[PDB]
Design a protein around this ligand. Structure first.
Ligand SMILES: *[C@@H]1O[C@H](CO)[C@@H](O)[C@H](O)[C@H]1NC(C)=O
Ligand SMILES: *[C@@H]1O[C@H](CO)[C@@H](O)[C@H](O)[C@H]1NC(C)=O
Ligand SMILES: *[C@@H]1O[C@H](CO)[C@@H](O)[C@H](O)[C@H]1NC(C)=O
Ligand SMILES: *[C@@H]1O[C@H](CO)[C@@H](O)[C@H](O)[C@H]1NC(C)=O
Ligand SMILES: *[C@@H]1O[C@H](CO)[C@@H](O)[C@H](O)[C@H]1NC(C)=O
Ligand SMILES: *[C@@H]1O[C@H](CO)[C@@H](O)[C@H](O)[C@H]1NC(C)=O
Ligand SMILES: *[C@@H]1O[C@H](CO)[C@@H](O)[C@H](O)[C@H]1NC(C)=O
Lengths: 1002, 48
């Protein structure tokens, strides 16, 4: 019996109140829409695995289910709890109660506490010794199974038992319906409401929907492509390949030699052709101290080194810390110096008994006098008499004459720090010699075309092992790449060149439409060949979920290498070669011309992010909010945060400058006339409404309505509030309605809007006569086009993309700064009052310094990110200023600069930190085929038009403008005489009618 | 030049490739991987 666990099992990971915020945590929940087992309560209590937890639910009418026993043995062998409610008392004890032969309740006593219509959910668990009683009682009208619905599960009481539970058995009442979901260490997108009840949850490691849900930090994901994690072909097994060494290495010889050298003449016993286990080393408990500097003290047995040195010399107990990098003293400067980059491991075992004669060990020497400090890993055998005083010796005593070497008298009667030792500093080195000293770990066969865990002679990695033709020289052993990582190795048992290449990997991206549209799931494996992973293979990779379609459509969710996915028909996810458009060959010839008989005025919403929220952080408040110590430690960095404050205030001032250049190019106050007799062009939707309490446009109202702190970082209010930004926009609209381009240049010249469209028509090379000829028609088209703007701008959220995304981008920038106030950066806490209130000041410089280098580096990424973001905003804002100057404040002849089509004008509209332009453009609609010739020959002379294109419908020749079909007879006030008809190719016979001819003939 | 090479360099595998311990210590830095991956993704969709 199986059940779909619809929505049940969500509880509080913590009981800290949150409002309208989605918190992601790793915790133990059962998955949503998963498989759970269904039980009855007739005549069943097997001991199910409570590996980390289950969710219980009861359909109850007479209170039969009354208790539980949880544990690891559950038989009074371990500490196991029992629950009974005798109608007056709650009794939860783990004490040694007498349990029945079959455990029921009727119808090591360390924890020293001694005293359908209802769905009951109880989760008894242990996390870190806390015992959380989770309870919820919920009324329903349902009888068939567990209901569909959301129920937060809250803690009540925490008790001190802290019990291991790995498998559990339910408790019956004798004279239990439940569900078992295996919890996993999964990450969960949790939603809190303003009243503090968890209303929803997502197990987000389950399906592509949920993976997008917790990577986008939202319960509703837009239709698009989203990378969620990384796919790596996991190694199925481990291959070890080491040389066929057959001899146990004399490590025991340099431990158990009959004599050891002094520090004056310590030996270099060099090692090759060996096996080093180090397990006997760790199994020996003789080690008095084991300060292992380059490599792990414990984790060394599996590791393989290239060469090893046993630097055996006897030195005192207090001096064992002087065998260390950076150490100084008599021995460290005169006998044996370790480099600051010493890569190895130091050995010293408890050894008072062996290298110590009972009458005194006199054979160990050391140097106490030398004119200069010694070098790392050199050997000085020199015995020259040290010069101390002034006069020299010819082999006599006196001044300047002591032997620079003198010995220790090693007796067992010495002090405890003065005791003799067999200290033997096995100076390990990791170099790149031929690696010989490997842990045994018997070898396996060489797999091919399958990436596994390889360890070739101490070199580890993940990849496939293939044969190569790479001709090694016999001394050479390893291969490298341009990126100096390992390219090839030779198998040290069989002399073969093995190429190493890590297998197919890469991030996983997810194709998913809107959750308001679909819940069908899809996954994408890019640059993975469809072996190692309704499956499609393309050049971009292995695509699983979408059926491959030979028919081509327009790209909705891009995949890669020309593949795009979408949601269509019954609807489904499809994968296809994306269309480059409709496949439309042109009807070219030497004499084929197409000129439009019809046009339309299309309006396009080029929306541009012009400005940003003037965020300004404080050296004091943001970085070190209300902390004298942290403010002092930031001024410890000098002027560093001061140029950051300078830079952010500069971003504020240049944002004001962007807004000033796009809006306060105007020098005066322009206001709209009380009558809107605009020649048929009603602007009450784009112009401010006097009936509105704030004098803004209606489309601006839907730009304010449909599209729309105190903790150390503030927002500076704009120099220009929203209402008077709207006032500047109204000024620009008024100037470009009654004054057009003139007020941008100089004095305000009142010009009608009909004139502005008519003269703007001339700009793009279409004649203004068409405008006054179809004034009513284009008034209808332009008004209904602005109405289509109103409808689209009120219906599609995607129409505000380029401002919604940038306002969101600033929101995520600020939000990541906010999230760094949770980030620890290696410090033990992230709230500065917490870290200061519990750290003593001397270690608080260290903790605060880690926290502020993390905070300042994150803030540095932030301020550089908004420096380049304000550079992008300022580039688009100089683009917006030139756009307004040449497209609002004048007419631009730049084709495709003011939206698609022949630009006419543009209308500014204020928006939250942005400008929406209503670019009116000329777009041709319907065209006809005509026959064309380069020139017309009339009386032996070739004719070329001053304006427009020669055309013929096949019966009569006409000249017409390049963007609208206006046929007129070829006239010499539209053409000119030039050249002769014998040179130009493609010229045709015709007659050209001079308008002077009827005047002179009449 | 109209585009760069569309490098999609992932934070966790570039810094701590085929490693769990380093990725666990790196996620303890907070968000640097998610804004770095979002930055690279923004770069890639910017070339697109
Ligand atoms: C949460 O609490 C408020 C305050 O009384 C209440 O009015 C509301 O109905 C509660 N439930 C919600 C918001 O779902
Ligand atoms: C050692 O390994 C080589 C691998 O080429 C093999 O030919 C040889 O027989 C091995 N010898 C022993 C004693 O295992
Ligand atoms: C993908 O794997 C198939 C399976 O043999 C192979 O034939 C094909 O060549 C592979 N694709 C590429 C691009 O190598
Ligand atoms: C050309 O097509 C447009 C499309 O709406 C129409 O309004 C206009 O009247 C047409 N002109 C002629 C001359 O047919
Ligand atoms: C104003 O525009 C509306 C469009 O909703 C139109 O119905 C109305 O006739 C226009 N008024 C004037 C005076 O042009
Ligand atoms: C190219 O133009 C010449 C002169 O107009 C014409 O004779 C010839 O047929 C044209 N080529 C084609 C393929 O029509
Ligand atoms: C007409 O054009 C032809 C070239 O095709 C040229 O030879 C002739 O002189 C032109 N004029 C006439 C026939 O009057």
């Amino acid at each position: 019996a199986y059940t779909n666990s619809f929505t049940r099992g969500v509880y509080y990971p913590d009981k800290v109140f949150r409002s309208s915020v989605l918190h992601s945590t790793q915790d133990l929940f059962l998955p949503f829409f998963s498989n759970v087992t269904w039980f009855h309560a007739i005549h069943d209590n097997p001991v199910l695995p409570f590996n980390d937890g289950v969710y219980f639910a009861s359909t109850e009418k007479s209170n039969i289910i009354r208790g539980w026993i949880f544990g690891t043995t559950l038989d009074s062998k371990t500490q196991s709890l029992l629950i009974v409610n005798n109608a007056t008392n709650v009794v939860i004890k783990v004490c040694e109660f007498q349990f029945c032969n079959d455990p029921f309740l009727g119808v090591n006593c360390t924890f020293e506490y001694v005293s359908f219509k209802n769905l009951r959910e109880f989760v008894f668990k242990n996390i870190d010794g806390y015992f959380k009683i989770y309870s919820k009682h919920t009324p329903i009208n349902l009888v068939r199974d567990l209901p569909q619905g959301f129920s937060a599960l809250e803690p009540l009481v925490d008790l001190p038992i802290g019990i291991n539970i790995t498998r559990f058995q339910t408790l019956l009442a004798l004279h239990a319906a439940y569900y078992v979901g295996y919890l996993q260490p999964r990450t969960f997108l949790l939603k809190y409401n303003e009243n503090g009840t968890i209303t929803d949850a997502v197990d987000c490691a389950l399906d592509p929907l949920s993976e997008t849900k917790c990577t986008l930090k939202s319960f509703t994901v837009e239709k698009g492509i989203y990378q969620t994690s990384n796919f790596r072909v996991q190694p199925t097994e481990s291959i070890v390949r080491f040389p066929n060494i057959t001899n146990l290495c004399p490590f025991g010889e340099v431990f158990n030699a009959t004599r050891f050298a002094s520090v004056y003449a310590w030996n270099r016993k060099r090692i090759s052709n060996c096996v080093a286990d180090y397990s006997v080393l760790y199994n020996s408990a003789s080690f008095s101290t084991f300060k292992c500097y380059g490599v792990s003290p414990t984790k060394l047995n599996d590791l393989c080194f290239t060469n090893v040195y046993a630097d055996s010399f006897v030195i005192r107990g207090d001096e064992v810390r002087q065998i260390a990098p950076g150490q100084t003293g008599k021995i460290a400067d005169y006998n044996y110096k370790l480099p600051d980059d010493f890569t190895g491991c130091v050995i010293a075992w408890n050894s008072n008994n062996l290298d110590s004669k009972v009458g005194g060990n006199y054979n160990y020497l050391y140097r106490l006098f030398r004119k200069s400090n010694l070098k790392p890993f050199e050997r000085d055998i020199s015995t020259e008499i040290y010069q101390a005083g002034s006069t020299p010796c010819n082999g006599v005593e006196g001044f300047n004459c002591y032997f620079p070497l003198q010995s220790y008298g090693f007796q067992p009667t010495n002090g405890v720090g003065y005791q003799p030792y067999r200290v033997v500093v096995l100076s390990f080195e990791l170099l790149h010699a031929p690696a010989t000293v490997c842990g045994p770990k018997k070898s396996t066969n060489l797999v091919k075309n399958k990436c596994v865990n390889f360890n070739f002679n101490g070199l580890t990695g993940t990849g496939v092992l293939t044969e190569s033709n790479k001709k090694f020289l016999p001394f050479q052993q390893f291969g490298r790449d341009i990126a100096d990582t390992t390219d090839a190795v030779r198998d040290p048992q069989t002399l073969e060149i093995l190429d190493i290449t890590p297998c197919s990997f890469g991030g996983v991206s997810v194709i998913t439409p809107g959750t308001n549209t679909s819940n069908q799931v899809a996954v994408l494996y890019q640059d993975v060949n469809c072996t190692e992973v309704n499956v499609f293979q393309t050049r971009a990779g292995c695509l699983i979920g979408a059926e491959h379609v030979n028919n081509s459509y327009e790209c909705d969710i891009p995949i890669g290498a020309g593949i795009c996915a979408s949601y269509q028909t019954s609807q489904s996810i499809i994968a296809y070669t994306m269309s480059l458009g409709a496949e439309n060959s042109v009807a070219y010839s030497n004499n084929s011309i197409a000129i439009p008989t019809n046009f339309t005025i299309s309006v396009t919403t080029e929306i541009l992010p012009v400005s940003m929220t003037k965020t300004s952080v404080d050296c004091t408040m943001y970085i070190c909010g209300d902390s004298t110590e942290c403010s002092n430690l930031l001024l410890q960095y000098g002027s560093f945060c001061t140029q950051l404050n300078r830079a952010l205030t500069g971003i504020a001032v240049e944002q004001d400058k962007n807004t000033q250049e796009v809006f306060a190019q105007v020098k005066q106050i322009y206001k709209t006339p009380p009558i809107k007799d605009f020649g048929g062009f009603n602007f009450s939707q784009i112009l401010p409404d006097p009936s509105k309490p704030s004098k803004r446009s209606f489309i601006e109202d839907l730009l304010f309505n449909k599209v729309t702190k105190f903790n150390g970082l503030t927002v500076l209010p704009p120099l220009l509030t929203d209402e008077m930004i709207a006032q500047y926009t109204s000024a620009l609209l008024a100037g470009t309605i009654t004054s057009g381009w003139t007020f941008g240049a100089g004095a305000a010249l009142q010009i009608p809007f009909a004139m502005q469209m008519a003269y703007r028509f001339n700009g793009i090379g279409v004649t203004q006569n068409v405008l006054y000829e179809n004034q009513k028609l284009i008034a209808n088209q332009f008004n209904s086009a602005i109405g289509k703007i109103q409808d689209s701008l009120s219906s599609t959220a995607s129409a505000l993309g380029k401002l919604q995304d940038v306002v969101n981008q600033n929101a995520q920038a600020l939000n990541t700064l906010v999230k760094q106030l949770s980030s620890n950066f290696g410090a033990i806490s992230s709230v500065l009052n917490d870290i200061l209130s519990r750290l003593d000041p001397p270690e608080a410089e260290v903790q605060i310094d880690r926290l502020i280098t993390g905070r300042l580096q994150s803030l540095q990424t932030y301020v550089t990110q908004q420096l380049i973001r304000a550079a992008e905003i300022r580039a688009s804002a100089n683009l917006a200023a030139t756009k307004m100057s040449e497209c609002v404040l004048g007419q631009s002849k730049r084709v495709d600069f003011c939206g698609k089509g022949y630009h006419l004008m543009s209308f500014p509209q204020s928006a939250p930190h942005g400008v929406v332009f209503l670019h009116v453009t000329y777009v041709p609609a319907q065209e006809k085929n005509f026959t064309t010739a380069p020139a017309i020959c009339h009386d032996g002379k070739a004719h070329f038009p001053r304006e427009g294109v020669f055309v013929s419908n096949g019966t009569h020749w006409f000249v017409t403008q390049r963007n609208f079909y206006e046929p007129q007879i070829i006239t010499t006030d539209n053409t000119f005489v030039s050249g002769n008809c014998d040179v130009v190719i493609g010229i045709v016979n015709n007659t050209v009618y001079d308008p002077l001819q009827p005047e002179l003939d009449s």
